[PDB]
Design a binder for this molecule. Structure first.
Ligand SMILES: CCCCCC/C=C\CCCCCCCCCC(=O)O
Ligand SMILES: CCCCCC/C=C\CCCCCCCCCC(=O)O
Ligand code: NA
Ligand code: NA
Lengths: 278, 279
């Protein structure tokens, strides 16, 4: 009985193995830069997006998926539907997925559909989708999957260091956080348990910030041998491999992987950004 | 051989007969003050004597949490691992005292595995967390693994209650954010927030329809009820507890359920006729 589908909004990256699996499906967000309106799918190559961001003087804007396209993704032959979305504190994607479930039941009746508020972004959503699959392979019931994945979400922590925080700041995703000292100061950012962004540390220069971020991850992680560590990078794979090396010096994980940022992740992480989740 | 672990629960958390007979569960008592009378909340305090004293006293009851020194002493024993389950940190100093007791322990003695769980609940909410600790230990998990699994359960755990008399919680500052209703026979359906505070979930006219609405609230929030234990605490109204149990069974199936009489602390704040439901 593998009658299930894992729906993830487009911010959550897919590894090549997940793309070849068939059980993972994306629901794409929208991206708007000046007078260009794009859909965050696999037809939007990262370089063209980064080049458009670089030329546009105006900050990029994004839009969550509509409830109707969530509902359409629920309507299929799979018995159990699991939805993984951006943090509800950072995007309307969660509320839209929940509304799509209400629309589905009005048009088609009851179905086992659960929407997971990742309280995170990017590879945070990826790891949750992988956790759903792991639970399904272990033979859990639908409600057992929900409980175990919601526990993993509670254990999961997100961290990131960017070169350019302006897109998150201008789009209202950094409210409360204090902003200009040394020009090479790099804040180490992270999630809160509620799914908002906070500042965890700071360092002058990228090399020192990556070390401090590695320390922050290691200071919070528990039972790391049971967990997969994910790293998303925006056009800086050698920086991603260095972060992986720093983290391996500090704790042992079950496994780890590195992925390129999705369209939404690229828009908000910007050129040179690094996101770590475990 | 020494016991591998002990679960310390403050006296608000009721023990089932099976837990009372298990030396792996141990209470740390709170204090109860009603007019000129001071009681330790332990098994030697009869609920009827407490209820009769409350009924006669025009003065509202007062309570006190355990001291950090008392918690520290409870940690110093032959059991290897110590788990502590306390009242919600937002409703009592019991959690802060247990954490301070741990800090004092590590300063005075060799390092020991001690973890304090903020239940963000009360009464059988603490009971079920203590049972979950035992379940995780029986599953063979490590200390860190037990801690992480129990904290996940705590986030899942929701508390609901309907009382005949909310005055003790109100007078003692435990309903700070809730608007009080004017006195036909409207009964508010109260419950926990994820932070461990009390909120009003619903309201109904009469006790019978209040229990129905509470049962609806429990059913609306519960995840994977089939694997969970549902607990019902009642203060001198066992038939009301069995009716609530019946209403919940109409809405979802659980692995098992139990009913217990309220502890001393739970009795003081739930009062005669109170009902508490946790799953
Ligand atoms: C709570 C932890 C968040 C970690 C953020 C990591 C940095 C960049 C990843 C992309 C974050 C995107 C957040 C804003 C998405 C808004 C999309 C929309 O609804 O328009
Ligand atoms: C957060 C959910 C709370 C549910 C409350 C259920 C009603 C009665 C159970 C007893 C509650 C006791 C709370 C106050 C305890 C204060 C003890 C102290 O003096 O520190
Ligand atoms: Na559309
Ligand atoms: Na008084």
């Amino acid at each position: 009985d593998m009658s299930y589908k894992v729906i993830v909004d487009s911010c959550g990256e897919f590894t090549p193995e997940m793309k070849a699996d068939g059980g993972f499906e994306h629901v794409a967000l929208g991206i708007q830069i000046e007078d260009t309106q794009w859909t965050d799918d696999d037809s939007l190559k990262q370089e063209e997006l980064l080049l458009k961001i670089a030329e546009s003087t105006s900050c990029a804007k994004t839009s969550c998926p509509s409830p109707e396209r969530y509902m359409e993704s629920y309507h299929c032959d799979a018995e159990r539907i699991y939805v993984v979305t951006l943090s509800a504190e950072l995007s309307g994607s969660y509320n839209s997925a929940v509304l799509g479930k209400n629309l589905y039941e009005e048009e088609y009746g009851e179905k086992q559909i659960h929407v997971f508020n990742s309280r995170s972004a990017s590879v945070g959503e990826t790891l949750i989708a992988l956790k759903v699959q792991q639970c399904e392979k272990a033979g859990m019931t639908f409600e057992e999957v929900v409980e175990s994945v919601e526990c993993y979400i509670e254990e999961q922590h997100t961290y990131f260091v960017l070169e350019n925080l302006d897109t998150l700041r201008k789009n209202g995703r950094l409210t409360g956080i204090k902003s200009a000292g040394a020009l090479n100061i790099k804040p180490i950012m992270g999630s809160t348990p509620q799914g908002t962004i906070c500042q965890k540390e700071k360092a002058r220069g990228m090399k020192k910030a990556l070390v401090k971020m590695a320390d922050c991850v290691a200071a919070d992680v528990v039972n790391a041998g049971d967990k997969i560590l994910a790293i998303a990078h925006c056009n800086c794979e050698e920086r991603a491999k260095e972060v992986q090396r720093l983290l391996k010096e500090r704790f042992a994980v079950k496994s780890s992987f590195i992925v390129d940022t999705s369209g939404i992740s690229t828009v908000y992480a910007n050129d040179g950004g690094i996101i770590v989740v475990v």
